[PDB]
Scaffold this active site. Structure first.
Site: not given
Ligand SMILES: c1nc2c(NC3CCCCC3)nc(Nc3ccc(N4CCOCC4)cc3)nc2[nH]1
Lengths: 43, 269
Positions: B13-14, B18, B20, B130
């Site tokens: 997802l990201g 540190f 992923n 923040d």
């Molecule tokens: C805990 N951490 C989460 C995410 N992580 C993010 C990405 C890493 C650093 C910032 C937070 N994304 C989450 N949701 C997402 C849902 C769809 C996402 N996409 C973007 C567009 O393309 C489809 C997938 C990205 C993140 N949820 C979450 N819970």
């Protein structure tokens, strides 16, 4: 990427989870956690 | 206790400096969540172990529909894993960037959710410090989720001294080297509301010194397209004197919030 994590199957699962919330407090919240002092020690 | 073999890994997802975050499904209950994976050695080398410990302690004890839930956590030989609520609609900042600015309905809804979440935090003497779009995610029905607690502190008794947060969002008291309290979050909520509606933060400047100058002078210049109601709320939050800032209960009760918010509470078990 497995089938469950992509197209309609993900969407439907997410919708199902929103409308039918499980008891996360007992399903995950009661389950033991490593002590925060242990996090950087032996597993 | 949990291990990584209890989860089907779906997709990344990201990416962070540190570890992923992955979309994951825990096998037992077929329950979809996010797994944040951090490397123990990198955390130690960077000297951020106590920092991560604080973030986990704060977030793992908060239960609110507009705060991203941390279900549990575990570790193995090399990694620490955080089991997090999945936010299906993703990054709020990406949505703001895509649209340029949000309409009044979207913005008021976000403000109600934010004020509710922050009230919950302040009730427990947690200050966020923040609030900005980049620290917010969105739920299945677009609900705001406070996602990051990197600058947060449990502050039961003493006023705080740490300058922290984000340039455009800094309250005057931080810039001036005064002690601060929970009312910093009130200020940041005002900046956030302005950015939602305008698409740029109110004190935008080419230099850190000029931004600082605008903040401490509260050099607020409303664009002509803003409604009287929205300007009223923003003005009541962006007060130089912390004690004069509209309380979070006041934000939730503000007529512009009442008239425009379409907030829906997620179903509970
Ligand atoms: C805990 N951490 C989460 C995410 N992580 C993010 C990405 C890493 C650093 C910032 C937070 N994304 C989450 N949701 C997402 C849902 C769809 C996402 N996409 C973007 C567009 O393309 C489809 C997938 C990205 C993140 N949820 C979450 N819970």
């Amino acid at each position: 990427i497995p089938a469950w994590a992509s197209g309609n199957l993900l969407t439907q699962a997410i919708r199902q989870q929103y409308y039918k919330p499980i008891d996360v407090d007992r399903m995950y919240g009661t389950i033991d956690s490593p002590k925060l002092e242990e996090l950087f020690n032996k597993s | 206790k949990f291990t990584i073999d209890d989860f089907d890994i779906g997709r990344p997802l990201g990416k962070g400096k540190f570890g992923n975050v992955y979309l994951a499904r825990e096998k037992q209950n077929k329950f979809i969540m996010a797994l944040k994976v951090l490397f123990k050695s990198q955390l130690e080398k960077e000297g951020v172990e106590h920092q991560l410990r604080r973030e986990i302690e704060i977030q793992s004890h908060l239960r609110h529909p507009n705060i991203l839930r941390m279900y549990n956590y575990f570790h193995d030989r090399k990694r620490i894993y955080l089991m997090l609520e999945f936010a299906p609609r993703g990054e709020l900042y990406k949505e703001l960037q895509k649209h340029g600015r949000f309409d009044e309905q979207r913005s008021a809804t976000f403000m109600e959710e934010l004020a509710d979440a922050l009230h919950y935090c302040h009730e427990r003497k947690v200050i966020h410090r923040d609030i900005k779009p980049e620290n917010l995610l969105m739920g299945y029905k677009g609900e705001l989720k406070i996602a990051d607690f990197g600058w947060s502190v449990h502050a039961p008794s003493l006023r705080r001294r740490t300058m922290c947060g984000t340039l455009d969002y800094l309250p005057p008291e931080m810039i001036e080297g005064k002690t601060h309290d929970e009312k910093v979050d009130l200020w940041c909520a005002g900046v956030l509301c302005y950015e939602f509606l305008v698409g740029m933060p109110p004190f935008d400047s080419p230099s850190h010194t000029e931004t600082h100058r605008r903040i401490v002078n509260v050099d607020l210049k409303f664009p002509p397209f803003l409604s009287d109601g929205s300007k009223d709320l923003i003005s009541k939050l962006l007060r130089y004197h912390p004690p004069q800032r509209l309380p979070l209960k006041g934000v939730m009760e503000h007529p512009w919030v009442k008239a425009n918010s379409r907030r829906v509470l997620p179903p509970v078990y």
